[PDB]
Design a binder for this molecule. Structure first.
Ligand SMILES: Cc1cc2nc3c(=O)[nH]c(=O)nc-3n(C[C@H](O)[C@H](O)[C@H](O)COP(=O)(O)OP(=O)(O)OC[C@H]3O[C@@H](n4cnc5c(N)ncnc54)[C@H](O)[C@@H]3O)c2cc1C
Ligand SMILES: Cc1cc2nc3c(=O)[nH]c(=O)nc-3n(C[C@H](O)[C@H](O)[C@H](O)COP(=O)(O)OP(=O)(O)OC[C@H]3O[C@@H](n4cnc5c(N)ncnc54)[C@H](O)[C@@H]3O)c2cc1C
Ligand SMILES: O=C(O)Cc1ccc(O)cc1
Ligand SMILES: O=C(O)Cc1ccc(O)cc1
Ligand SMILES: O=C(O)Cc1ccc(O)cc1
Lengths: 476, 476, 476, 476
């Protein structure tokens, strides 16, 4: 298990090929746009060494201690252990960090346990898993093709190499060129270029699955407008430390070593990779724990805002808070059933229930916008009446302490709270979180169509046919 | 455990004091408006004797066999057994019977296990429980006051005795007069006049809890407009057999024997009766199983309708069906967590988790109208193109077999299906189901306000305060 | 202009070929299922002769007086006159009659004014218009094909003649066979078999537009389950008089005289018939007035229910009523703009603004379910506590007058009101109204796709391009 | 009529008492946080002198030319002229500037026309109007009290002077102390401290209405966190120029000259000021035109995004765009009816219809969040894949031109468009717009309660009573 210092030193020494506003980022650990999230990930690693959480976040195996997200679960108890680690890490950042590495470790763990799925590339998968685990490396990923002409398939874009495709194969590996649309949290040592979870690969030229060091020559991470509001924790409680960053990933004829190839030119293998291996089940397990943590944070903030300005005495405000409670319980319920109904898949890997997780990941994208709306409706103008810590420290400080106090709440505490509520919903950072929840796991339109097609609807249809037998009997 | 014949004979011999359109109902077992539901309840009782389900629906105890809903659960396994019985009974009627007796048996069971709660009336409660259990009697209940002037409390209505109040107490018992607004499924041997689950009793004169035989002199059940569409199972697949009926309950100076009194003049005891005893937990347990069954029925019908007319090829139709699947999984999740997180209450009674059940009973009233809407959006005009079995048997039968066939579906089967979908949503019977789901457990406005007030929000608020410490540190 | 007596005599003498539950309906004017709506339509005709409304409902022209819905408007004032007639008729039945004849007269009127559109069949159209106008006949229509396999076009169903198609052409006319899915209000002298408003005709064999007497040999109207709750106006205030009935229309090799043919084998003419002639504009004009009347009825009922039980003192109840007010004003606004922005089309016919009417007919289907929901949320259990007038007239009458009185409202008046609210929303009749509002003008999915394609979006796109010029200038 | 140069010189010479992060803003015309919006307002003033729009934006009167928003309308044509000016100004900034001065000029104009309402202060009002008009000054306003303890009235806060209250009265005027919660667009010469539009004044000490120069000693404007993303029009198309800023307004014992007092200590006059004078009608008129402009901008962007990435070929995407079209038409309809149904009030001032405007201002806050959602659902990941103009100008420029091109759309144009869509919805600037639309005119909860109470519901209730006469007749 890595310490924060080791993670920071690793990035400083071999930084990912990041670009920000036309220039290469030489040191993300000190760059104003990235130092915040780097410190945050480092803190997650350090927590693994805190005696209070060591048993929760890591496990011992043959003299070594590994991060819990690498544990191949053999029992429901192990599944619960993975869940508790997901939750503890998520709580550190109020569920605002959506791409912490344990999400992808769940994917790699499942791929490794179900390695036979990959055929001749099975050993590469097992070895890669052990590599990430032993060195406790941080990962980022990109599974989608550039949004250019969505009316056409990957092979029907303006250029055959807009999506990442194989240019040629050599004795050393494969050369790829193209791009992936989005990779969140590029402050990692490795990047996973895996298949889409719900979309079809289309052509063999694009049916790929491989991993590379983020410093690989020819690999570029083009960052979008930064959403770090500032460094003050009072003024920007969240964006100052949890801005993971999103970027376009470019492959300028990048060489991928054969040992890092997991799938090559096999459309079928790409299309069922997550479902067959159980990666889908485990990555969704991390998500349900994460969204439970996020919902708990919103509940706390909503309750405090309402109490803070005396709005909690109004029935409709109480109802809005109760609504968040209902959603919180719904997520806890999915989480519980996912673990309690777990069964082994075709490769003997115990996986959390897909029914419960499909329910959670398809329901939360609908609940989140409403949870966000509730905070807006409760806070109202208090959400934009945001003086700075500098205003409190300035000449008008005394006036602010009078006009911005709340009901039995000091002004500084009140503004600190509303600054947080604002950063969770209305700052550029907060607003992005909404778009993230709506789409990170896929386009809801196609996720729902996928659920329809894969779900076994026969038992329910059969019960109706049986019930209708009495109806048709009138003609006998 | 009762057989259907015993239930039917009991009603015929000592029928409840029912009134329909100005006249007393002499024999509900043969009356056109009630014979359907009577036969349905009888069938539920008979199922208890089917060898295939005997072990699911009943339990043996000291030479006797009792209905599962009377079982005082000692372990989570027992809780699961109660749940499986709720589900099996619910499935028989596609979850359309909302007031089957096992719901109230759950209440009485909990009251009995937590009998110490009732003080001097504890033995009356225990004895009543044993009575209902041993004779396997059917119950109905009414907990709300007449909807007259909702702007005023029970003691502020046009008359002190609009709500049920104590007139006087004698050596034989108490005399009560007033009325209860609604009692569903009056085809029972007993009626439970218990306190409101979420509303305050208000005055001692109304703080009551007692049970009476439905034939008690002075007790009247005034039925509303019947929703039985007819007797043909083809034309009215559900209303012909599952119309439970709703009625106003009148108490014309009714004498309640002391042995049938459970709470008298104690506002506090009335206000916490369901929560303290665990009745709330267990009755909600029956509800979650019931709504899971209901959602399964809608899923089957929606899937069959879409497939039947070839609408399943359209993405948005697939999405609507997937939406029902998400809701189904949500209910299954609440159900699972309710049992898995069960703990004993203050009286040593194991009760399913309130968090999960409060989530289920406060979420489903919001989901149901949408599930109903989905069926309407899928069926469209097919939902009102409802010829009768008589039309198929008539001269135009051949034409109907051509114009009303579906995609690889015969016309009679198609119409049988749409007649069912219509009866589940648009017939008077179907439409009532929507109002029922919206309100049976209470007014959502006050249920949400209640949830807000009773839920422990402190842990979430505390986490936010801890997170904000860094914000306030800028002033140090 | 016809009188009610003339309409009733016409139906009695030459009744439409109606079938109900396997038998031919010999006299709809006395049949229990149809006498109610027949009396209602008759009353609409009689209103044309009431001196108070004669000038509103009819116009004089060359010694004759015709129904206002036949008036070819030359000015905005004439358009307003047509609107006021639509409204007055709609108000008589609280906007519950969705297929009153003035809706179709608007269609025929527009077809006649724009008759050149129909080419060689132009005179047939003009003559038909004059026929309907002079004799003030009642019409019904059916524009959709049987719902069999929606995954296939009209020419791809299990049989080439499931949809209405031309079998052959002779010296006397054309012979057609097939069926139309739905025709509401079959108590008419004529039936209009016109093209779909938003769907493509597909094949020439189905590209038809003609009209026939409802008694034409080979023509059959198969009625669905009747929704008449009874004859008591107290018990069934609406279903006893406004149940229009829906039916499947069968064509058993029906001969259509050449003079009654308006479009034959011309897919293009069918696909643009309503838009080019202005029929769409005028029929939607009747609809907006009708929905304004319907919304006014719901507002009145909601206000009275809330006041009646004292629920109007609660903020959320006030908000729900205000919501209906907002929707009412929205419809009034569309109506006003539709008339004020009216312009002449290609044939010189003044037509109300399509933008405003497309807004109204695409928005109301979304608002109605909510308006219905609001009534349910306000009334709660009062909506199913429906004793009969017979109960009030019976032995328990005195008790009911006490327990069902409202806040300063007598019990009989209270129940009369809730019986009405129930009939508007939860009776089989009421529930059907919801499905009707959702679909009568077409499937929302395709109506919205149609609006997208026909609307001129260029001006808005152009404004954005202009705004972005400054953005692209940074590269100069 | 003012020119932009005159406005800029005025602010530079006598700048409002603005504070940003603890320091006084000496020159808002050059300050990085304010220079953008200052230039934008200046451009609005300059447009008044463009020959193409002079007749639209100004009117001549006795040798002088004034801004159209000052015109006291005598006819519906004048009302239309005011509307066209509101629209032209709104279009310049895609409806993103919510507090342009013409909104408040509408208020002052109405106050002046209905000056008799103010009694002894009537001349002060007339004179103030002429002052603002003649010098074409810019105004800002603040009507709400500090959000401290909403469970208590203005007189029940932690201090009697948290809300703005009169300390004393002298020969020169009144001295006030306290604060107003929010004032948007403080880059004005004058600030209007008027009564709340929907809330009660409460106590005479707070029942005030006056105006002051923004540089008045003791008056302070404390600005919130700035939302200007940068100066690049490519990177921040909107926040670089339309960030109006919100601020808390502090009154440190400010002296208000008697000539600037319009209402003093009269609760009744404060509570009906906007309705009686017609200010409510006219300010809402500006709003409906503004929201129509805003909706047109969103329609253009949504259409371009969908077309740009080829998503317009999908039915659901077309439906979402059509949804915006429906909302656009709804707003146009309210606007049209507001002008067409205009009538003179008690003071002879012609005012647009309140019914239509109450509909528009109570409906749009519900429509806007959905319009915003639609853009998010259409753009998906394209909304966060935002490289900078600097990235296009850098080494990877060529790669970006390939991977970020759209369907028949160049990469720079595509990113310029998505940068705009992002700034309209997800940037801190964009997200604030949502909160603004939800609350600027008041809390929806109380706006709806207000609408319920003031609307005349009697006609609808009367129609229902008349309809029910037939129901009650059964007892005769
Ligand atoms: C009470 C009532 C009264 C009516 N009265 C009249 C009347 O008087 N006269 C007359 O002509 N009609 C009448 N109608 C018919 C009405 O106009 C149709 O119901 C409406 O146009 C929808 O078409 P449909 O029912 O055939 O739906 P279908 O097309 O069968 O649709 C069923 C479902 O499949 C989907 N679907 C089907 N095809 C497609 C597609 N290509 N793309 C995407 N989705 C698709 C639909 O969205 C929907 O979810 C009435 C309907 C009702 C419900
Ligand atoms: C971006 C933005 C710009 C604005 N610009 C201006 C401006 O230029 N000038 C100016 O005057 N104002 C402006 N406003 C102020 C705006 O008018 C208010 O936000 C709105 O009137 C709501 O009042 P409030 O914020 O005080 O909410 P609060 O009253 O504090 O409400 C907070 C919450 O408590 C509830 N609540 C509080 N009291 C009650 C009650 N009695 N009954 C039921 N519920 C209650 C509310 O419903 C809500 O959920 C702006 C607001 C925003 C958000
Ligand atoms: O695979 C996809 O098509 C969308 C997606 C992307 C990243 C991820 O983690 C899950 C789903
Ligand atoms: O034409 C259609 O496809 C549907 C429709 C049917 C009847 C009507 O009056 C309007 C639209
Ligand atoms: O007056 C209020 O209570 C809210 C409000 C504030 C500013 C405004 O322009 C309109 C309404």
């Amino acid at each position: 298990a890595r310490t924060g210092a080791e993670y920071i030193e690793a990035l400083k020494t071999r930084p990912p090929n990041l670009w920000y506003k036309g220039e290469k980022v030489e040191d993300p650990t000190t760059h104003p746009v990235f130092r915040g999230i780097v410190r945050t990930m480092a803190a997650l690693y350090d927590l693994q060494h805190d005696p209070r959480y060591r048993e929760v976040l890591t496990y011992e195996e043959e003299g070594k201690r590994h991060g819990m997200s690498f544990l191949i679960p053999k029992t429901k108890e192990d599944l619960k252990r993975r869940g508790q680690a997901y939750k503890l890490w998520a709580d550190q950042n109020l569920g605002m960090m959506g791409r912490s590495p344990d999400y992808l470790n769940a994917v790699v763990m499942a791929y490794a346990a179900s390695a036979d799925y990959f055929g001749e590339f099975a050993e590469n998968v097992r070895n890669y898993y052990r590599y990430l685990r032993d060195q406790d490396l941080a990962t980022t990923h990109a599974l989608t093709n550039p949004q250019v002409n969505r009316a056409r398939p990957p092979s029907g874009q303006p250029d055959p190499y807009i999506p990442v495709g194989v240019v040629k194969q050599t004795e050393k590996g494969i050369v790829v060129r193209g791009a992936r649309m989005t990779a969140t949290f590029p402050l990692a040592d490795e990047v996973l270029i895996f298949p889409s979870i719900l979309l079809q690969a289309g052509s063999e030229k694009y049916a790929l699955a491989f991993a590379l060091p983020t410093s690989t020559p020819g690999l570029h991470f083009v960052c979008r407008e930064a959403l770090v509001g500032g460094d003050s924790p009072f003024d920007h409680p969240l964006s100052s430390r949890v801005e993971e960053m999103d970027c376009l990933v470019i492959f300028d004829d990048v060489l991928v070593p054969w040992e890092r190839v997991f799938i090559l030119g096999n459309v079928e293998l790409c299309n069922n990779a997550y479902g067959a291996t159980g990666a889908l089940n485990h990555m969704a397990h991390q998500v349900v724990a994460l969204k439970t943590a996020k919902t708990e944070a919103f509940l706390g903030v909503a309750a405090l805002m309402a109490e803070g300005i005396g709005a909690d005495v109004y029935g409709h405000v109480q109802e809005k808070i109760a609504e968040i409670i209902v959603y919180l319980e719904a997520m806890r319920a999915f989480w519980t059933r996912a673990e309690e109904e777990a069964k082994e898949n075709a490769y003997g890997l115990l996986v959390p229930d897909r029914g419960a997780l499909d329910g959670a990941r398809n329901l939360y994208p609908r609940l989140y916008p409403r949870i966000r709306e509730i905070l807006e409706q409760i806070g109202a103008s208090g959400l934009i009446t945001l003086p700075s810590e500098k205003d409190f420290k300035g000449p008008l400080g005394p006036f602010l302490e009078k006009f911005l106090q709340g009901a039995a709440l000091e002004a500084k505490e009140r503004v600190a709270l509303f600054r947080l509520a604002w950063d969770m919903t209305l700052s550029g950072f907060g607003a992005r979180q909404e778009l993230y929840e709506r789409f990170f796991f896929g386009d809801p339109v196609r996720m729902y169509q996928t659920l329809y097609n894969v779900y076994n609807k026969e038992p329910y249809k059969e019960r109706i046919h049986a019930f209708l037998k009495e109806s048709l009997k009138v003609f006998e």
